[PDB]
């Protein structure tokens, strides 16, 4: 017990979700019923300042931070020993909140917790914990959540337009979006007229498809809510894998529960369209190498970069290579990117250029009104080399732009 408690305290990020009455809803490490008293303490701390016409935000201690966010009827607490600020941790807790919303709908959540506040939300969230752990891991390693933008799978322009046209040709009345997915990467997105897709819903869909293997056994038909699109209603997503050996995931979002045969049609139709045009060989070739190396750019002393286009809302990044082979090093690099992004995107003190020269790496951030570019160099790289890398990578992205981005987003 003494050893178990000591190991529990040493985790780098505890996440607790609890109701406004104190009853546990979720704990990342440890059981919820063994942490019931501490969650009661959390609710008491929230209420103590709520009754003082105040609101508790965070508690900062040497080495760690407790962050409270209150999205009634829930209180979400994060005890993080990481570098993340209170704003980034609140963003992660809000991502957890939107993950719970994607399962319950905000209307149902508020109604069930205003009819009674002694309700145990774990009853509705039973079996959905692993989604929360997968989402937290994705935050830990996926640059999309920090970027708030989608990553496009590098694919030839002819092939990309062919598969996009195949996606568009297979449509139904109830469909709102058509998404083609490869390892949390976008291949082709077809949306309805004047129906934008928020990045947060796309990240929640990433986490939904990447959390379970039941989607690999055939066709899936599950109700999923898009909180940033419509928080008071349930969509219905048809999730399929085109070929057993591939990682191609097709997501078809619809407004109708009854319409499943039609969506299964619009999946089979798109598949046979792709087979007829012969683009499936090219797609398989692209899947065999679904990332590109830094060495393709040609500038030495570069290790990784992120480039997001503000106009399109899409970002590109090369494969994570040495020395970030291990999960710890990938997490550290993502944390460096998080620091750069948070500093350059301060609400009151925004910045347009950041250059960090640490003993382990060099970090660069160039943020304009059109794009944001984050770069990693070896510590031996100089400043003039950094600027030359900026210019060479800008040229290379403006040359590979057709292959790396969806330039002509289709529409039904």
């Amino acid at each position: 017990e003494e050893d178990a408690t000591e190991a529990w305290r040493l985790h780098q990020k505890h996440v607790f979700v609890l109701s406004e009455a104190g009853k546990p809803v979720y704990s990342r490490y440890g059981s919820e019923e063994a942490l019931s008293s501490t969650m009661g303490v959390m609710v008491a701390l929230v209420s103590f300042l709520e009754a003082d016409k105040n609101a508790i935000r965070s508690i900062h201690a040497d080495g760690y931070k407790v962050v409270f966010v209150r999205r009634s009827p829930l209180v979400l607490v994060a005890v993080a020993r990481t570098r993340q600020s209170a704003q980034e941790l609140a963003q992660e807790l809000l991502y957890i909140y939107y993950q719970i919303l994607s399962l319950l709908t905000g209307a149902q959540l508020s109604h069930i917790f205003q009819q009674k506040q002694n309700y145990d939300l774990r009853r509705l969230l039973s079996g959905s914990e692993r989604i929360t752990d997968n989402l937290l891991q994705l935050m830990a390693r996926d640059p999309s959540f920090l970027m708030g933008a989608a990553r496009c799978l590098p694919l030839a322009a002819a092939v990309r337009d062919t598969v996009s046209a195949s996606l568009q040709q297979a449509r139904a009345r109830s469909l709102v979006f058509s998404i083609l997915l490869a390892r949390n990467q976008l291949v082709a997105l077809v949306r309805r007229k004047d129906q934008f897709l928020h990045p947060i819903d796309l990240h929640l869909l990433f986490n939904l498809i990447s959390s379970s293997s039941s989607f690999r056994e055939g066709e899936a038909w599950t109700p999923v809510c898009l909180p940033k699109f419509n928080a008071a209603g349930f969509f219905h997503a048809h999730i399929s894998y085109l070929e057993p050996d591939t990682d191609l995931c097709l997501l078809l979002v619809s407004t109708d529960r009854e319409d499943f045969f039609a969506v299964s049609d619009c999946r089979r139709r798109f598949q046979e369209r792709l087979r007829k045009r012969g683009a499936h060989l090219a797609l398989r070739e692209a899947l065999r190498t679904p990332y590109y190396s830094v060495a393709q750019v040609g500038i030495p002393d570069l290790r990784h970069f992120l480039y997001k286009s503000k106009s399109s809302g899409l970002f590109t990044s090369p494969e994570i290579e040495a020395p970030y082979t291990s999960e710890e090093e990938q997490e550290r690099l993502l944390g460096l990117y998080q620091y750069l992004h948070s500093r350059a995107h301060n609400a009151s003190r925004p910045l347009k250029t950041i250059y960090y020269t640490g003993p382990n790496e060099n970090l660069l951030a160039w943020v304009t009104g059109a794009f944001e570019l984050y770069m990693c160099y070896s510590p031996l790289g100089t400043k003039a080399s950094a600027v030359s890398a900026i210019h060479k990578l800008m040229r290379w992205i403006r040359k590979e732009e057709d292959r790396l981005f969806i330039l002509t987003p289709l529409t039904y």
Binding site: H14, T38, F48, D52, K53, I59, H60, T353, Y356, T357
Partner: protein, 422 residues
Amino acid sequence: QEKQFPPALLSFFIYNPRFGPREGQEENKILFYHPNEVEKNEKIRNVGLCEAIVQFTRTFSPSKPAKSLHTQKNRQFFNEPEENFWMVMVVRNPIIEKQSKDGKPVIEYQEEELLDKVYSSVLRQCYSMYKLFNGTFLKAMEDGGVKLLKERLEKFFHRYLQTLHLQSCDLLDIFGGISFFPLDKMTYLKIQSFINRMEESLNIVKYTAFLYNDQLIWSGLEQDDMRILYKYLTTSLFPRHIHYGRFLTGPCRFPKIFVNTDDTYEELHLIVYKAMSAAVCFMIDASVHPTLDFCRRLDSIVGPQLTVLASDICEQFNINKKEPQFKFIYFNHMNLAEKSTVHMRKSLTSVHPDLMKILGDINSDFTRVDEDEEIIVKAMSDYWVVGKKSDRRELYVILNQKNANLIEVNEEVKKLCATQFN
């Protein structure tokens, strides 16, 4: 016409949770509380909130308790200068008074403006300021009980909190260094010879310190005690008064200070003497009580000798005296040396106030690493801000070079480092 309300000291209280263990004596926990006119129940409620915060953070890191609590309306900073003795400072968040569609005053609380390090350092400085003049809490306890402790706490902090201005607190308050007076070796040797001569001829004078132009020159005390003594001399003692040799503190009452508290706990009478701006501080053992004739004897002995020395520094300083585009703040941890070309004597900032938050955040990101580091940033206000941490030295440079790239900024930084820090 938006209205800006700066941060203000909402409240300040010192308590001890070990006092009043049984019910009904929670009021005994609160050793000191400001404002005093606040209701007793509210005082107990605030103290209990702080105790609960610390006891809750002890469930994730028993060795490291809470240092801060952020709320919508205020930020509360905790400190435990002595075991079980907790000071808490509650500071109001900055306020924007927006005019809505039909006026409708909207009170937005800007929760991200305050820098935690500034007010944490201010709280630590409050404790050390108390301890310089009244010693530790435990010593006063073993002397005269909770009653005596409370009288000492009130008598110091009632007058100390009046002089606290939290709107002007900035990075220099985080630093807590000493603004030294640069000099050559010959004048340094002259200073040492003079200090030895007077502290040996006067016998009972056991400690000494020499400052010029409000800047410290030579310090015979310990670093962490001379720090607070220099803050007292510069920000409290000199402004109240701002051969020509003149007594500045004394006539015979001399303030009693406590230095080397962690090792010897020495109580000394403090004596300050001025010739021009050449301040000389003598520190005498508490057993010896100076008389009117002693200071009269003291006046004669120091007298023209300090005046002769004082007229010597001014000539050399004037002799040593294009425009430096760099405006920097430099802090050295070996000697607590502090230099600043940004802040001038108003001391408040002389640059656009939106860049001090950037300068404070660079400091915030610095201390996570104990190695060489450099952060170069360009604000949306086309200002360049660099920060370098190397071998226990921190340098913050601000430049107005809106038409400049990274290479020119680095060249300017290197030129500054080569010239101003040769």
